[PDB]
C-alpha cells in the first residue's frame, strides 16, 4: 500500500523553471524525512534535496544549490521540488524517496521507486557531432599493423571493437585526443590472412560504423 507517485516532468527550455510533485500514501507521511533523487544518463544516483519530517530543515546538493527548492505539505501528503534556471546537467529521471544517500542499504533502492518522472532540458544535441572513420594501412606473418581513425566527433566517448568483438589479441585502442576545433579523435590499431573490420560505436550521436581496412 506504500506508494510514492511522481509527476510534473517534461521538456523545459534552459534557464526556465519546472515544478515536480510527489503524492504519498500507505505510510505516516509526516513521520518521514523526504528526498528527491535523480539519475542522469551515464551517471549514478544523485541525491539533490532533502526536507525534514516537519519541513524545518532543507539540505541541497551543491549541484543544485540556489536553484532548486524542496517543500512539503503534511496536510495533503505531497512533496514538491521547484527547479529554477535549469541546465543540461538537470536532464535526468527524478524520484521521490524516503531513503537518503547514507541509508546503509545494500540493495539498489531505486528498485522500489518505480518509473519516477522524467525531466528533459532541450538543447543537449546542438554540439553533438558524429564520427568519421578512416582506415589505417601501411603504404605497401604476424608482424604488420592496421587500424582505424575515428575523427571529428563530440562529445565523449567512442568505443571500438574489431571483427564484431572476435579479435582481441593485439588490439590497442588509444585514449581519445582533443583537437583544436573542440572535437575529439581516437585511434585504434591491431598488430595475416583474415579480414579486419573495426566497429565504431558513438552513442551520443547514435552512430554505428563498420569500416573494413584494406
Amino acid at each position: 500500500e506504500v506508494q510514492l507517485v511522481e509527476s510534473g516532468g517534461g521538456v523545459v527550455q534552459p534557464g526556465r523553471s519546472l515544478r515536480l510533485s510527489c503524492a504519498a500514501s500507505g505510510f505516516t507521511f509526516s513521520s518521514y524525512g523526504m528526498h528527491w533523487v535523480r539519475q542522469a544518463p551515464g551517471k549514478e544516483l544523485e541525491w539533490v534535496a532533502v526536507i525534514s519530517y516537519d519541513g524545518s530543515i532543507k539540505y541541497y546538493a551543491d549541484s543544485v544549490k540556489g536553484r532548486f527548492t524542496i517543500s512539503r505539505d503534511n496536510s495533503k501528503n505531497t512533496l514538491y521540488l521547484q527547479m529554477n534556471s535549469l541546465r543540461a546537467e538537470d536532464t535526468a529521471v527524478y524520484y521521490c524517496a524516503r531513503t537518503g544517500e547514507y541509508s546503509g542499504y545494500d540493495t539498489d533502492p531505486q528498485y522500489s521507486w518505480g518509473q519516477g518522472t522524467t525531466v528533459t532540458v532541450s538543447g543537449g544535441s546542438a554540439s553533438t557531432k558524429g564520427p568519421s572513420v578512416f582506415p589505417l594501412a601501411p603504404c605497401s606473418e604476424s608482424t604488420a599493423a592496421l587500424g582505424c581513425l575515428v575523427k571529428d566527433y563530440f562529445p565523449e566517448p567512442v568505443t571500438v571493437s574489431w571483427n564484431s568483438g572476435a579479435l582481441t589479441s593485439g588490439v590497442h585502442t588509444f585514449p581519445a585526443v582533443l583537437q583544436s576545433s573542440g572535437l575529439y579523435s581516437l585511434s585504434s590499431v591491431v598488430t595475416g590472412t583474415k579480414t579486419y573490420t573495426c566497429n565504431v560505436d558513438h552513442k551520443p550521436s547514435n552512430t554505428k560504423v563498420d569500416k573494413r581496412v584494406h
Binding site: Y105, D106, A137, P138, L149, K151, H172, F174, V189, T191
Partner: protein, 213 residues
Amino acid sequence: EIVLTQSPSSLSASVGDRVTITCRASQGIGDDLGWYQQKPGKAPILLIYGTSTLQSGVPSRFSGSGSGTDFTLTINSLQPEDFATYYCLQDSNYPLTFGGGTRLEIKGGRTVAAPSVFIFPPSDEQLKSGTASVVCLLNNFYPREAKVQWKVDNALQSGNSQESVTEQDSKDSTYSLSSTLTLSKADYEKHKVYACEVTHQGLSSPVTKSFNR
C-alpha cells in the same frame, strides 16, 4: 558511494616473499569486505570473504584480517601463480565498490623492449574533405619514455601533431604510443616524403619509418 583505498598501488616481489595489502574504507563496513584476485584476461575471482574466511580451494598461505575500516590481505611465501592483481570489495552498502587494485608483479619482468614502429598515410577518403592525417604507431615498448619527431622533406614538424599513449599492458607490461600529424590537403600536396623518427632506449639509434606521396 563508499570509497576503498588500497595500499600499495604496485608491488614487485620474488617467489617466497611475504606480502601485505591494506584497504581502508570511507565509512565502517563491518565484516562485509572481500578480497579478489584478477589475472590477465580473466575476471576477478573471490579468494576471501567476510574479511577472513577463505573460499574453498584457496591455499592456507592466504589470510585476511581487519574489522570496520582498515583491512589487510596477507600472502605468506609467494608462489608463481600468486602474481596477479588483487582487489578489495565491500558489499555493505549499495552500490558494490572495488578498491583501486594492487598489482603484484615479478621483479625480473620489466625488461627493455624496442618499439615496433609503423607509419600510416592518410586515406583517400579523408583527403577529399580538405584534411590529411598521418599516423605513426610505436607498439610494445618499455619504458614509457619515447620521442617521436615528424619530418616532411627532412623538415622538422611541430605544433601540428598530437600523441596518445596506452597504459601499461596487463599481459606483457609494455607501452604503446600513437602520433597523428594533421595537415591540410593543399599542404599535404606540396610535399613528397613523410617520415616518423623514433628515439627509444631499446634502439641503438633512432628508427625512421617513411613513405612517399
